[PDB]
Design a binder for this molecule. Structure first.
Ligand code: FAD
Ligand code: FAD
Ligand code: 4WL
Ligand code: 4WL
Lengths: 340, 340
């Protein structure tokens, strides 16, 4: 009963934990190893603000809306716990700004107190003429990743610093089940032309008077490419850079400018806020998440592979529902093998 | 014209600013001095969290609701102003929690996006069965008082550290108009049987993940005597203590425990918060604010006095509408001295 999880971002970590809680037994022990090239604070998960917000429009797969709703409901149950702070979990309200009356999102009833913005509220954002206000949740990846690791290490899970070259390399060493949570890099283990980097740049600023998230939406700039302000526990994330096919890990100076000028125009009080840091990450962009089983067609034994990658700009938002689905796929592997 | 403003809390400073910006001219040159025994951070204004919220039910004087509304409208028009950070001015959303249903407040349309709490939002507060959600403003005194002081200084207003023994002592040194903004200590200059300290105690805690205010209402505890959580710029104010007639300036453990126990039950995450500081202050409690002119008959001349005190637990909420009214009374004085 040897299981190897490839990846230590929110995907692999929550998957490892979910499989362990649901399938570990002293009767039938479950050996679980996590192999990863990069760990916290150096994953894509660490670059995220951690705000819960799926895409505005209905997903290519309606199963994704269920996975996001299951994640919200799960995080909402731990929000008023003493453990909440160790997770990087907290409630936050905020604004979604538009230039037109776009349709209501499928998640209007999952979030708390969703409503349209009133005239006086919109008078605060002269560049926008429609929007929403609701209460959502922030799950900060750097705390959540450390918390998941702590809970994994105490459940018997060993962590290994390694760049996996092939699934067959892992299959050869005895892995019965391979959990593929490689994010944006998955194409290195198996070609997937639907998987692309969604290059992102963010600024971390000191603006503690900022109690609300502010997200803007422009068709001319596209998804995740217009100003956003997201207050964290210690700092405020400034963003709004999406570049499909861009693999540059360096901080582009025109992007730094776009972030600064766009966010200051959105919220003039940012102009006097102290810039703390700047980061680049690659969103694992895909028309839909890949969350399925694959029987390896290489080597003398067939190896069971659970793929869990391609969560684009909403991995923190959907991680739990995806972890639970991967655990379901895992139990299906267990039954098909044998009972007695 | 020689003006002496007694008091350097929010009332004294905003009145002095409002009078100077409206009346100092070539036609009416004003010599304004401010006398105060205590300056920031040692005034009642400094103990306050600075949240804008008047009384729920219609005031004894309907003028008070107009004065609070004028204050919110003025502060709201500056929320994105270059000076907002210097003022300590920012937007904040939050909860007003009740055991039973209560009528909508007279200010429901002054605040932003006022509405009732939904069942899912109410499930987060088991001890309460009814509530509101709205967006208001915080104006922090430690910043606001220093901002008003800098504004008065550039206008040529002179500040003196002194404990005024009597209005006559001021009148005898040449004051034409005395603006009495002495807060809870006004009785020492002229007996006021309707003025009492509304003793308050607060804790300032490090809980930066707290993004909303939470105010609880209990008619058995009375006004300002039920737990409240008010996130500021650097710290979160924990309070909920009102002791009518208590002149003790010391912080006490009983009140420390009431605050801590009450606010931790409301928000379990507070258990792990670091306590930064604790303060005691005296709300200037009266059945209504005394904002009126008086011709003082103590000495060879009559001195024109403007009283502006008795703002209770809502001095920050109402200060600007009161400062504008004091200025109108000041104009009536100049108009009588046959020089306007
Ligand atoms: C700028 C920006 C802002 C964002 N904001 C939000 C937000 O507010 N809310 C939200 O829900 N989402 C947000 N996201 C998306 C979120 O960051 C990602 O969807 C989530 O981090 C992807 O999770 P992951 O586990 O798949 O990838 P990662 O965190 O990238 O983990 C991939 C893991 O796979 C490992 N790995 C890959 N290949 C191999 C190999 N061959 N061998 C060994 N290890 C390997 C890596 O080392 C790493 O451990 C944001 C993204 C960006 C870029
Ligand atoms: C615990 C607590 C929390 C609160 N929270 C809020 C809130 O969130 N929002 C809100 O709107 N309000 C709040 N308040 C109300 C606000 O603090 C007071 O209404 C406002 O501070 C009253 O201001 P003031 O100018 O009249 O008095 P103060 O701020 O006390 O200043 C009185 C001034 O007069 C001076 N003075 C008095 N007598 C003399 C004399 N004889 N000679 C020389 N100088 C003299 C003092 O030295 C001082 O400079 C709160 C109050 C308390 C106690
Ligand atoms: O840039 C992103 O990928 C991103 C910004 C926000 S705000 C909520 C989710 C999310 N994702
Ligand atoms: O304790 C007080 O006097 C007080 C608490 C709050 S919250 C808004 C006003 C106000 N006043």
């Amino acid at each position: 009963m040897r299981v190897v999880v490839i990846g230590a971002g929110v995907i692999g970590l929550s998957t490892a934990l979910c499989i362990h809680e649901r399938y570990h037994s002293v009767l039938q022990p479950l050996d679980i190893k996590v192999y990863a090239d990069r760990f916290t604070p150096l994953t894509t998960t660490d670059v995220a603000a951690g705000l819960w917000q799926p895409y505005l429009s209905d997903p290519n797969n309606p199963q994704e809306a269920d996975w996001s709703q299951q994640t919200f409901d799960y995080l909402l149950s731990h929000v008023h716990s003493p453990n909440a702070e160790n997770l990087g979990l907290f409630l936050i309200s905020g604004y979604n700004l538009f230039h037109e009356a776009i349709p209501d999102p499928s998640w209007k009833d999952t979030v708390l107190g969703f409503r349209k913005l009133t005239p006086r509220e919109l008078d605060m954002f002269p560049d926008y003429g429609y929007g929403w206000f609701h209460t959502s949740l922030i799950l900060e990846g750097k705390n959540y990743l450390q918390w998941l690791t702590e809970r994994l290490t105490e459940r018997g899970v060993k962590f290994f610093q390694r760049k996996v070259e092939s699934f067959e390399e892992v299959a050869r060493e005895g892995a019965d089940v391979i959990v593929n949570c490689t994010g944006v890099w998955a194409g290195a283990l198996q070609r997937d032309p639907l998987l692309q980097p969604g290059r992102g740049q963010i600024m971390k600023v000191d603006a503690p008077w900022m109690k609300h998230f502010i997200l803007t939406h422009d068709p001319e700039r596209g998804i995740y490419n217009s100003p956003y302000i997201i207050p964290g526990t210690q700092t405020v994330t400034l963003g709004g850079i999406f570049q499909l096919g861009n693999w540059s890990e360096l901080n582009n100076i025109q992007d730094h400018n776009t972030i600064w000028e766009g966010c200051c125009r959105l919220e003039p009080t940012l102009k006097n806020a102290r810039i703390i840091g700047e980061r680049t990450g690659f969103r694992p962009v895909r028309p839909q998440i890949r969350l399925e089983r694959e029987q390896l067609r290489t080597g003398p034994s067939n190896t069971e592979v659970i793929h869990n990658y391609g969560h684009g700009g909403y991995g923190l938002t959907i991680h739990w529902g995806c972890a639970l689905e991967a655990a379901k796929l895992f139990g299906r592997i267990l039954e098909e093998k044998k009972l007695s």
